[PDB]
């Protein structure tokens, strides 16, 4: 690999340099190389990886949607062709991550939930663009990954925990926008927000700001769905 000659620590530095320059492709590449040094990632390190690849796929998803709606309205092959080009590119980045999870990353409870949530998210991103035989294989996967992460979080983390909270938010969105199950989607989100405020005394100084936000986002989604 191209990062194979660099020190893990110099790769972490440059990932952080890239985030400052908002060069998230570089950022993701640096973090892929650090992961491939074979060592566990720290909490700070997990989130350098996630933020880098999320910003990458996020721009691709946004471009895909712009083109896809053009392609819908339009129904020349140039729109299909460009849509398919951005699509194939997006699929590759998800594979790169799902491969990085299924080979080095997938320990402690927060660590295991973190990576299983990533697995469910990037399977979900592929679901957004899939169709046919190959497609539904993808939906079940996003769901197993999420479920397993739900199981762990429910037993091992308090209901105010940011990872538990953010995972559930995304699992709700998965139900709504990916499984045509507004029922489950809304149930999870309401239960999640409710249970968290029921045990509101469990917020910690280190993450309370994050938990408050994910709770606000859970109610933002709920307002939007009803």
């Amino acid at each position: 690999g191209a990062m194979g000659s660099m020190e893990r620590a110099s790769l972490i530095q440059k990932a952080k340099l890239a985030e400052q320059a908002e060069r998230y492709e570089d950022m993701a590449a640096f973090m892929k190389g650090a992961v491939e040094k074979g060592e566990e990632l720290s909490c700070e390190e997990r989130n350098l990886l996630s933020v880098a690849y999320k910003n990458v796929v996020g721009g691709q998803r946004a471009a895909w949607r712009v083109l896809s709606s053009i392609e819908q309205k339009s129904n020349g092959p140039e729109v299909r062709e460009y849509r398919e080009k951005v699509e194939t590119e997006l699929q590759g980045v998800c594979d790169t991550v799902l491969g990085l999870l299924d080979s080095h990353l997938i320990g402690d409870a927060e660590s295991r939930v973190f990576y299983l949530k990533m697995k469910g998210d990037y399977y979900r991103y592929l679901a957004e663009v899939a169709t046919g035989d190959d497609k539904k294989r993808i939906i079940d996967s996003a769901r197993s990954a999420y479920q397993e992460a739900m199981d762990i979080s429910k037993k091992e983390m308090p209901p105010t925990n940011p990872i538990r909270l953010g995972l559930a938010l995304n699992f709700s969105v998965f139900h709504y926008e990916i499984a045509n199950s507004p029922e489950e989607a809304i149930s999870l989100a309401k239960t999640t927000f409710d249970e968290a405020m029921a045990d509101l005394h469990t917020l910690s100084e280190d993450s309370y700001k994050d938990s408050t936000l994910i709770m606000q986002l859970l109610r933002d989604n709920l307002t939007l769905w009803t």
Binding site: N170, I214, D220
Partner: peptide
């Protein structure tokens, strides 16, 4: 669109 993190 719905919020994810």
């Amino acid at each position: 669109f719905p919020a994810t993190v």
